[PDB]
Design a protein around this ligand. Structure first.
Ligand code: KNA
Length: 133
């Protein structure tokens, strides 16, 4: 179900990430640095447990979760959120909730590239990742 998402992915295109970060209240200096990083995202499974690593020269994160089971998460920008990840229409949908706010992180495979769509408020960011061999 999740298996074509698995592997190591590198950022190769980003649209509106500053808008997304600014909507979340990320400070200008953090948004500068983040606008020039190209993270590596690593998605692995072990049975029902998925681990998603995001690595860069600026911030690293790692989460582990079971699909469809809520988990606590502390995001790269230090939000303490309630999260759930599920498959919906073949897309991996990550919903974060905190302080009555939500944001979605939706991953879809198109022509072998992983497209991550980030939505918070009205801001919609699209980031494209290509698979590492
Ligand atoms: C400044 C941090 C905003 C939340 C995480 C952004 C994740 C983006 C990515 O995985 O490409």
């Amino acid at each position: 179900m999740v298996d074509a998402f698995l592997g190591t992915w590198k950022l190769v295109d980003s649209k509106n990430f500053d808008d997304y970060m600014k909507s979340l209240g990320v400070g200008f200096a953090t948004r500068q640095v983040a606008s020039m990083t190209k993270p590596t995202t690593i998605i692995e499974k072990n049975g029902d447990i998925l681990t998603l690593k995001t690595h860069s020269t600026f911030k690293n994160t790692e989460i582990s979760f079971k699909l469809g089971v809520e988990f606590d998460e502390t995001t790269a920008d230090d939000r303490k959120v309630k999260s759930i990840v599920t498959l919906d229409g073949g897309k991996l949908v990550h919903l974060q909730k905190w302080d009555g706010q939500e944001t979605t992180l939706v991953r879809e495979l198109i022509d072998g590239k992983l497209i991550l769509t980030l939505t918070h408020g009205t801001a919609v960011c699209t980031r494209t990742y290509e698979k590492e061999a």
